[PDB]
Amino acid sequence: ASIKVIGVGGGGNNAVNRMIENEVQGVEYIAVNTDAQALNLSKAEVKMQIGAKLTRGLGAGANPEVGKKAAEESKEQIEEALKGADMVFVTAGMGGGTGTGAAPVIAQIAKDLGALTVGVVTRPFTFEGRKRQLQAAGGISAMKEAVDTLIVIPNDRILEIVDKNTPMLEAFREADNVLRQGVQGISDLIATPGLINLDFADVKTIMSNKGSALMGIGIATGENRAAEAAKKAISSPLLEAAIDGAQGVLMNITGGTNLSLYEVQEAADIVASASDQDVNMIFGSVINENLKDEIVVTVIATGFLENLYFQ
């Protein structure tokens, strides 16, 4: 019901701006940062500088311990901002100071206020280096303890989706779009008009597994678009483990006014077929009138036990 999306650090702030630009419905936005200049580029109504005394508005120096202390020092302000939320999406890039350190604090605060708490985070590109990778892993570990479900987006896999000539700036931009998709894929089903909506209880079920979660996105146009987009979503490089490993599955199929119930069910069947016979699966559909013939299928698959996929 009351849904808040809280963007923590640069990548999270970008995901929040993308949602606002795209007029995503039914949610309140909160932008959090230690970097006051980055925060002043936010489009969010609620802009929350944390660590003012500690960081002086200059960011966390890529130190997760500073992001953490900043969040701890602004605990009261965060609690007030999230008060009464039924669901909170805590969205952040991992590997820096602010996202890595503050997001897990914010997540535990959201849990403590009684919110269904969903983390949506990116693992940094390998090109960012080993220190970024290691810090990110620390953050992902803390986030996993602090949320109900943690959706982890591997940025390296984005480089498998986009053109090989994609510039680095656009690669980051695409990462932040995938973050936005991880949030909107779920929130739209609860908040926005479609052929099939889900209530909080429905979502709440699959979003309360242990392990971690992954997402896949598929886009298609043309007569066989529903089957094609559904297969693309489950075959997505973002979905690093096959969906038959998942304990729960949510499917969102979004399209224009020419998307039919038959297409929704056909896509759902394909996803169900690739899943465990005992999966808990839910699905919905929403209409975006700016789509003509394009449809977008987002699968969120939860309950992957990390130990099963250890290299």
Per the CB < 8 A criterion, the answer to whether 58 and 35 are in contact is yes
Assigned token pair, 233 = 């979503």
Please pick, from the candidates 56, 173, 210, 292, the single residue that binds a second copy as defined by CB under 8 A: 210
CB of 141 to a second copy, least distance (A): 5
Determine if 9 is a binding residue for Na ion (CB under 5 A).
yes
Q: Choose from Na ion, a second copy, none: what does 185 bind? Cβ within 5-8 Å by kind.
A: none
Determine if 122 is a binding residue for Na ion (CB under 5 A).
no
Q: Choose from Na ion, a second copy, none: what does 96 bind? Cβ within 5-8 Å by kind.
A: Na ion
Assigned token pair, 205 = 């079920």
Of 49 and 108, which has the nearer Cβ to a second copy?
A: 108
Q: Count CB-CB contacts under 10 A for residue 181.
A: 22
Q: Distance (Å, rounded) from C-alpha 103 to C-alpha 156? A: 21
- For 103, the 3-state DSSP assignment is helix
Of 191 and 241, which has the nearer Cβ to a second copy?
A: 241
The annotated binding site for GTP is made up of 10-14, 97-99, 128, 132, 176
Per the CB < 8 A criterion, the answer to whether 283 and 202 are in contact is no
- For 156, the 3-state DSSP assignment is helix
Kindly write out the interface string for residues 231-250 of this chain, putting x where it contacts a second copy by CB under 8 A and - elsewhere: ---------xx---------
Per the CB < 8 A criterion, the answer to whether 285 and 196 are in contact is yes
Determine if 307 is a binding residue for a second copy (CB under 8 A).
yes
Number of residues that bind Na ion (CB under 5 A): 5
Residues forming a β-bridge with 149: 118
**Binding to a second copy, residues 85-144 (CB under 8 A):** 133-134, 137-138, 140-141, 144
Among all chains, which residue has been given the structure tokens 């250890």? 310
What is the 8-class DSSP label of residue 47?
A: E
Q: Distance (Å, rounded) from C-alpha 116 to C-alpha 127? A: 34
Kindly write out the interface string for residues 270-289 of this chain, putting x where it contacts Na ion by CB under 5 A and - elsewhere: --------------------
State the chain's maximal CA–CA distance in angstroms.
58
Please pick, from the candidates 100, 149, 212, 302, the single residue that binds a second copy as defined by CB under 8 A: 212
Please pick, from the candidates 13, 34, 98, 285, the single residue that binds Na ion as defined by CB under 5 A: 98
- For 304, the 3-state DSSP assignment is strand
Determine if 152 is a binding residue for a second copy (CB under 8 A).
yes
Q: Which residues bind a second copy (CB under 8 A)?
A: 133-134, 137-138, 140-141, 144, 152, 210-212, 240-241, 305-311
Which stretches of the chain bind Na ion, using CB under 5 A? 9-10, 96, 98-99
